[PDB]
């Protein structure tokens, strides 16, 4: 889930951008370096916001480009294990369903879709419960729980995320309403 992180960092500013002010040059270098990458501890680097303080450059032998201590805010989205997720199903597959949780997509296994048995109907390439007569189709809006996060590399595409859907308080909003109706009925009896 989205958050703002203030990070201190050293920026290698090449001689070709010596003309512009240090703030914009540091902003650009951080856009090229951090933006669009996955970090193991904070999530997905989405957008560099702004730089507050930039230090004077240090010339080190070998390159001639200036190195500056910088302070900046990065808008980063962090998935957290065992939390709640609001999203829509981007697509479905026989092994699992893809749930849009933000910058990256999550996977809901068919064994975690329903307590009831499910079958992958190929007529519309959609899921359908055996006895509940419920169904999932592309574009449906559902609520699920994140249960597993895996991070291979800094590429956001490769890292995968798996969710759960059977547990109480989750499901399609219509099913949530039906469960609320059942709760009201059992409270009234």
């Amino acid at each position: 889930m989205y958050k703002i992180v203030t990070v201190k960092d050293v920026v290698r500013i090449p001689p070709t951008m010596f003309t512009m002010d240090p703030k914009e040059a540091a902003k650009i270098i951080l856009r090229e370096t951090y933006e669009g990458t996955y970090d193991k501890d904070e999530g997905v680097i989405l957008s560099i916001l702004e730089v507050k303080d930039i230090k004077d450059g240090i010339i080190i032998p070998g390159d001639g480009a200036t190195y500056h201590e910088v302070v900046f805010d990065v808008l980063v989205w962090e998935p957290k294990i065992h939390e709640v997720v609001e999203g829509y199903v981007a697509d479905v597959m026989p092994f699992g369903a893809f749930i849009r949780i933000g910058p990256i997509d999550g996977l809901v296994h068919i064994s975690q879709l329903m307590d009831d048995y499910v079958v992958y109907d190929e007529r519309n390439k959609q899921f359908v419960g055996k006895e509940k007569k419920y169904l999932l189709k592309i574009g449906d809006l559902v609520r699920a729980r994140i249960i597993n996060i895996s991070a291979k590399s800094k590429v956001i595409r490769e890292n995968r995320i798996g969710l759960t859907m059977r547990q109480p308080g989750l499901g399609k909003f219509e099913w949530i309403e039906k469960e609320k109706k059942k709760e009201k009925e059992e409270g009234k009896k």
Binding site: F18, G57, I58, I59, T66, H68
Partner: protein, 93 residues
């Protein structure tokens, strides 16, 4: 009849008498008291110095000239001690 400046002689003598005793300039003296492992191993006895350094687990902080040459990093002498700083916005006249 050879003319050498007194200051060089003073430097050599002061380095020779820096430990409170007069000690040689060779492998059993000033060189043998160098802290850097690689600097000592480069001079004369090499396998003995490396084996004894591995025995005691000595660390080479790379504060000298010889080892920085061996690894291929700037030596801390002459232009190697100059730290440079620069204000970024440059405006040609």
């Amino acid at each position: 009849g050879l003319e050498v400046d007194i200051r060089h002689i003073m430097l050599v003598a002061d380095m020779m008498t820096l430990d409170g005793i007069v000690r040689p300039i060779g492998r059993h003296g000033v060189v043998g008291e160098k802290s850097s492992v690689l600097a000592r191993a480069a001079f004369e006895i090499t396998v003995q110095h490396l084996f004894e350094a591995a025995e005691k687990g000595e660390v080479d902080n790379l504060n000298g000239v010889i080892e920085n040459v061996l690894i291929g990093q700037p030596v801390p002498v002459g232009t190697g001690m100059v730290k440079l700083t620069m204000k970024l916005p440059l405006r040609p006249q």
